[PDB]
Design brief:
The structure is cut from a larger assembly and holds 5 copies of chain A. Chain A has 1121 residues and is of the alpha+beta class. The first copy, chain A, is 22% helix and 28% strand. The radius of gyration of chain A is 44 Å and the shape is extended. Chain B: This is Spike protein S2.
Chain lengths: 1121, 192, 96, 96, 48
């Protein structure tokens, strides 16, 4: 039978305590919602008879999760091993209460000893049941025991009282046991609850474990026959088993370092997102969890169908090898050649290979093979290699430094020495110039040392041209003759001639497959092609130089090669709060490819559901699974790609006051660009706003990164001496890095100053608040803050998780443990150091207050001269004019405006209190800095190809030369990483600096003045803004004027009186239905049309859309009266 | 976007194990590129997305004489780009590039099932813009439609309709030129 | 030049060195590429923000900034899309 | 401690490690905490202090008086970093 | 600076580091020294 694991079987991976922080790990864990098999001991009488006593042998697999429900103390433990019994690697593991015993040496008992029956028959022992663990200590390696135990031996009965759960596995030779005990009340199923298992055993036994079997006692009594074979009563018992799988997990270590919750990353798309974020809760969004690739269905091997076998047997055992000056060359072709025969053979003294490794040779096909061959003396054999020089190497025989092939040689005294003495193998003494690669020259003209007359005669100073090696059997190791073969190999630029002994297969196209063509290995989809291949060409290449097309060696047809389908796997989660239903977008992939890419044929049926299903849809972006297509044009909540977005929406559901997670589905659709709106447009239709909403559209900009500096040496070296010296080899890098970061640090002070410092003095506020109703109280500083920030600044301060503040760190403050909580301290150890801003949080608060106080009391003026005071109600009167909203509009609605502003500010407090999303950019920047620093820190742990990430571990271990080589690599890695970090900081600094200058401009234009730049300040027409300090940034409470309400009206570009056309000086002409008025551009203040409101120009005829009306002359009443 | 492992390794196991020793470089690169990709959509939204609602062009073109037809979308075209946009699409070239053209072909190849070309680039990838060239056409048409139909207003408030002729007065004043200069030459400006 | 060839040709002990060289070079190339892309991205982003500003000021409104929009006194502008970018038809008034 | 090594200051702390846990870590890998392998108590790790020795000076031509800033360092530490206790009393003057 | 004259300012001349005043080592206790020494004092040793 099968049951559900739910979450159980997680255990503590490491000895490390963490306080309320989440750790991502990789280990053999029992997967979530895995189907655990259930085993039983049970007795139901009757002819039918259910009786079972399951003590089977089971496979260990990747490791095991085991659980026994237990009242009675029935299950004793297990026997593990490759064998599961005393044949070979085996582990007898017995548990009795507190005590545990283990034994490796051959066991006396079989699969299990017999037990259960106690109290004997009578008063005396009668000891029939004999049990023995071991005897005749002979050939005995090992045994282990843990403290003695006392058994409860209750004998009482009840339902299962408790659950004993365990995990078993061996890693690095260390066998481990993690275990846990819990109370329970149910036999039938495992609990849906979470509790991690903790480590009891951790021994370096080294025995691998393939299989195991459980130990459980059998009862016997007067009722039972008592026969050892039969004669036993099982009672009823049950246990569960499941197998671990190497997988990444996320663990929730709580405040006291216990593991409260866990996530199997591999379980589903939700789990994959959780792990990506490294968080138990993940927000609504799209996450690039991993990459997807169609795996190879099968392996295809192709070679020319040539049966014949090459002449190596002849070449290696030739009667006579060539004299080296004369060196022989034999072309080898059209055959199969089994290199392993050569490689395996004892016959060769030296095997060296330049381009290839000997094992691989069988795997390849060669365009051409040449056996260069000759006999040479031992001292010289070394010469036959690339880059060499010598008597042979200079003139006699030489290889290209680039050469590909293997050089094979063996001592052959018997093969070339002569008792008489064999002189015959000649070499070249002299030549005009050095020999070329694979060149050979016979010329034996007599060489003259200096007198010219000798012509073709060996005279006094004319010596015979060619020398030879003397080979007597007496020769001596270096002295003796050695036979040599250079198997030069041509390369796969051309048609394949000679191949390794491999099998060949079917040509299957259109499937993704591994493919080997003539030794060109690879993976891809093979298809027919209409390529123009010339008769000589074997295959073609991409710009990448990778093989693009290949001629099939058997058919000689031309095949195109394409990559097997792949793309990223973005996951769409509605937000953990909302639901646990998730959908996956496989990027750019066709859905039809989807089942095939994944190993559906191989995989378990659990995997089967994930690949198929009715819920599948395809986008231009790729294939989307789990989501359901929707026709409705809804706004984009989570972006998919190619215009597709998703939202979590209801289906027919029953309304519930309580929120419930279930039902509903993730819909995906072509997103609306927002709601559609057919504008009311006409040649004479205008919507003048009747009313407005003053708003405080908060805009937030990062002003600085978190000022950082790095001690180059401390970071790279940790101040270690050898490393410190090695860094010197590099030169100016440390300095330039410090200079770069110093540039960054100064730039940060500069941007903070450039933004905030815009005023020469700290203007301070009056004790009296008479603002005309505007209630700044939240924005202005609180006198007893302490740290006199304003309330809103405080909310911002609290809401953002500041990297740190009030940069004072007592060295004693950390000392031991605690560094852990304080990341900043951890960095402080770290070589990395945050440098306090020139303006402290308090000073910034004073500056922001100065700016604000000036903005309140003086307005824009403090930017130009010294602050010139003006009443607040008067300042707004300016700002309104700046909008084009005539000033009376402020006063006539003064209290109402104050109320709107005050209320809006109230809303700001609520909004900020409500969500981080308001906080946005700063929160992001703080995270970016933290992330960058974290990355830089974790990089210290990275190998970069070195033996260890811990520098001391290298220095302790290796000889100095090797240590420097490893260290140089580590330094190179860390340096590259530090430079990448600095580059990242620099590029980010550019983004931050752009933001800083932007902030500075906003402060200059928007605070210190009123920017006309539309949509520059916040969202609307802009009155003024109040800066508020925030960690590593600033917030502007842009008080933007926005028209809220409007009515349809009829308009004309001009109006005619006399035939002359009047135009509005400011504002525009508008009529309700009945009368015509001039109105300000952004507020409906209808005014009777007059000469004061307008100016005349030319005549009416030129203008399109001009209308007639009457204009009021203000003089007329004076005349009439 | 680039699959760092696929690019470096081709996803070969013998290689990938080694790439991991390299540490966070690979992960950060994927993130950096992803960041860039997101930044592109962001740039697109920051630029184009400035409108909350798609303002739709009116039936009847009575803009006073300014002929928008070249700039406005043509309903006939499947992707309903404007005429000028079509010139732009043609001019920006697909033709010279060997690689890109090869990429272009896969989107068209409807006929074959299970063809994931993403793998074909040797690890490189292009992710579509969230606002498709088609959607952008609509978004730009919205910005344009607002720009025609409702002046500057749509940046601040809701789009408030204003006749195109009327809007120009709002423009001329911005230069310091009196509106009469506009109307007096309305037909002329239209032709210009 | 090709990784598969290395794997086809050499054992995992030796291949390590050659592949390490290749990975180092490729990685360096990738970082070089990404870095250029980042800096290029900076230019694109600057242009994006500039474009956004122009969309705000030149499109969504008008701007007094002389020679910011087009090359004249600026009236208004109409945006048009282009592959991987934007074109603005700045309606700038220029006295002839 | 148990093979874990480093330089820092050590101070007894009231953090509750579980009976199996030997050490504790920061947000990113730093081994912040340790249990003493003789006596079970848990110490809380501070980094030994360090910082840039920024040297404040007027122009050299103007004057050669100089002042030194030890970034984020605790003055108490200035005597601690150096072995003031070990030094002779002539040396001790410089510390405080 | 690598210069004879320095302008008014602040320069990061070096990185100050509180030196490890002392050195500490801590580990658990151990036993079980080599038993073969006992064989040397055998009636007859473990014959080679």
């Amino acid at each position: 039978a099968y049951t559900n694991s739910f979450t159980r079987g997680v255990y503590y991976p490491d000895k490390v305590f963490r306080s309320s922080v989440l750790h991502s790990t990789q280990d053999l864990f029992l997967p979530f919602f895995s189907n655990v098999t259930w085993f039983h001991a049970i007795h139901v009488s009757g002819t039918n008879g259910t009786k079972r006593f399951d003590n089977p042998v089971l496979p260990f697999n990747d490791g095991v999760y085991f659980a026994s429900t237990e009242k009675s103390n029935i299950i004793r433990g297990w026997i593990f091993g490759t064998t599961l019994d005393s044949k070979t690697q085996s582990l007898l593991i017995v548990n009795n209460a507190t005590n545990v015993v283990i034994k490796v040496c051959e066991f006396q008992f079989c699969n299990d000893p017999f037990l259960g029956v106690y109290y004997h028959k009578n008063n005396k022992s009668w000891m029939e049941s004999e049990f023995r663990v071991y005897s005749s200590a002979n050939n005995c390696t090992f045994e282990y025991v843990s403290q003695p135990f006392l058994m409860d031996l209750e004998g009482k009965q009840g339902n299962f009282k408790n659950l004993r759960e365990f995990v078993f596995k061996n890693i690095d030779g260390y066998f481990k046991i993690y275990s846990k005990h819990t109370p329970i009340n149910l036999v039938r199923d495992l609990p849906q609850g979470f509790s991690a298992l903790e480590p009891l055993v951790d021994l370096p036994i080294g025995i691998n474990i393939t299989r195991f079997q459980t130990l459980l006692a059998l009862h016997r009594s007067y009722l039972t026959p008592g026969d050892s074979s039969s004669g036993w009563t099982a009672g009823a018992a049950a246990y569960y088993v499941g197998y671990l799988q190497p997988r990444t997990f996320l663990l929730k270590y709580n405040e006291n370092g216990t593991i409260t919750d866990a996530v199997d990353c591999a379980l589903d798309p939700l789990s994959e997102t959780k792990c990506t974020l490294k968080s138990f809760t993940v927000e609504k969004g799209i996450y690039q969890t991993s990459n997807f690739r169609v795996q190879p269905t099968e392996s295809i091997v192709r070679f020319p169908n040539i049966t014949n076998l090459c002449p190596f047997g002849e070449v290696f055992n030739a009667t006579r090898f060539a004299s080296v000056y004369a060196w022989n060359r034999k072309r080898i072709s059209n055959c199969v050649a089994d290199y392993s025969v050569l490689y395996n053979s004892a016959s060769f003294s030296t095997f060296k290979c330049y381009g290839v490794s000997p094992t691989k040779l069988n795997d390849l096909c060669f365009t051409n093979v040449y056996a260069d061959s000759f006999v040479i003396r031992g001292d010289e054999v070394r010469q036959i290699a690339p880059g060499q020089t010598g008597k042979i190497a200079d003139y006699n025989y030489k290889l290209p430094d680039d050469f590909t092939g293997c050089v094979i040689a063996w001592n052959s005294n018997n093969l070339d020495s002569k008792v008489g003495g064999n002189y015959n193998y000649l070499y070249r003494l002299f030549r005009k110039s050095n020999l070329k690669p694979f060149e050979r020259d016979i010329s034996t003209e007599i060489y003259q040392a200096g007198s010219t007359p000798c012509n073709g005669v060996e005279g006094f100073n004319c010596y015979f041209p060619l020398q030879s090696y003397g080979f007597q059997p007496t020769n001596g190791v270096g002295y003796q003759p050695y036979r040599v073969v250079v198997l030069s190999f041509e390369l796969l630029h051309a048609p394949a001639t000679v191949c390794g002994p491999k099998k060949s297969t079917n040509l299957v196209k259109n499937k993704c497959v591994n493919f080997n063509f003539n030794g060109l290995t690879g993976t891809g989809v093979l298809t027919e092609s209409n390529k123009k291949f010339l008769p000589f060409q074997q295959f073609g290449r991409d710009i990448a130089d990778t093989t693009d097309a290949v001629r099939d060696p058997q058919t000689l047809e031309i095949l195109d090669i394409t990559p097997c389908s792949f793309g990223g796997v973005s996951v769409i989660t509605p937000g953990t709060n909302t639901s646990n239903q998730v959908a996956v977008l496989y990027q750019g992939v066709n859905c039809t490819e989807v089942p095939v890419a994944i190993h559906a044929d191989q995989l378990t049926p659990t995997w089967r559901v994930y690949s198929t299903g009715s819920n599948v849809f395809q986008t231009r972006a790729g294939c989307l699974i789990g989501a359901e297509h929707v026709n409705n044009s809804y706004e984009c909540d989570i972006p998919i790609g190619a215009g597709i977005c998703a939202s979590y929406q209801t289906q027919t559901n029953s309304p519930g006051s309580a929120g419930s997670v279930a039902s509903q589905s993730i819909i995906a659709y072509t997103m609306s660009l927002g709601a559609e709106n057919s504008v009311a447009y006409s040649n004479n239709s205008i919507a003048i706003p009747t009313n407005f909403t003053i708003s405080v559209t908060t805009e937030i900009l990062p002003v600085s990164m978190t000022k950082t500096s790095v001690d180059c040496t401390m970071y790279i070296c940790g101040d270690s001496t050898e490393c410190s010296n090695l860094l010197l080899q590099y030169g100016s890098f440390c300095t330039q890095l410090n200079r770069a970061l110093t540039g960054i640090a100064v730039e940060q002070d500069k941007n903070t100053q450039e933004v905030f410092a815009q005023v020469k003095q700290i203007y301070k506020t009056p004790p009296i608040k008479d603002f005309g109703g505007f209630n700044f109280s939240q924005i202005l500083p609180d006198p007893s803050k302490p740290s006199k920030r304003s309330f809103i600044e405080d909310l911002l301060f609290n809401k953002v998780t500041l990297a740190d503040a009030g940069f004072i760190k007592q060295y004693g403050d950390c000392l031991g443990d605690i560094a852990a909580r304080d990341l900043i301290c951890a960095q402080k150890f770290n070589g990395l150091t945050v440098l306090p801003p020139l303006l402290t949080d308090e000073m910034i608060a004073q500056y922001t207050s100065a700016l604000l106080a000036g903005t309140i009391t003086s307005g824009w003026t403090f930017g130009a001269g010294a602050a010139l005071q003006i009443p607040f109600a008067m300042q707004m009167a300016y700002r309104f004019n700046g909008i084009g909203v005539t000033q009376n509009v402020l006063y006539e609605n003064q209290k109402l405006i104050a109320n709107q502003f005050n209320s809006a500010i109230g809303k700001i407090q609520d909004s900020l209190s409500s969500t981080a999303s308001a906080l946005g950019k700063l929160q992001d920047v703080v995270n970016q800095n933290a992330q960058a620093l974290n990355t830089l820190v974790k990089q210290l742990s990275s190998n970069f190809g070195a033996i260890s990430s811990v520098l001391n571990d290298i220095l302790s271990r290796l000889d100095p030369p090797e240590a420097e080589v490893q260290i140089d690599r580590l330094i190179t890695g860390r340096l590259q990483s530090l430079q990448t970090y600095v580059t990242q900081q620099l590029i980010r600094a550019a983004e931050i600096r752009a933001s800083a200058n932007l902030a500075a401009t906003k402060m200059s234009e928007c605070v210190l003045g009123q920017s006309k730049r539309v949509d520059f300040c916040g969202k609307g027409y802009h009155l003024m803004s109040f800066p508020q300090s925030a960690p590593h940034g600033v917030v502007f409470l842009h008080v933007t004027y926005v028209p809220a309400q409007e009515k349809n009206f009829t308009t004309a570009p001009a109006i005619c009186h006399d035939g002359k056309a009047h135009f509005p000086r400011e504002g525009v002409f508008v009529s309700n239905g009945t009368h015509w008025f001039v109105t300000q551009r952004n507020f409906y203040e209808p005014q009777i049309i007059t000469t004061d409101n307008t100016f005349v120009s030319g005549n009416c005829d030129v203008v399109i859309g001009i209308v007639n009306n009457t204009v009021y002359d203000p003089l007329q009443p004076e005349l009439d009266s």
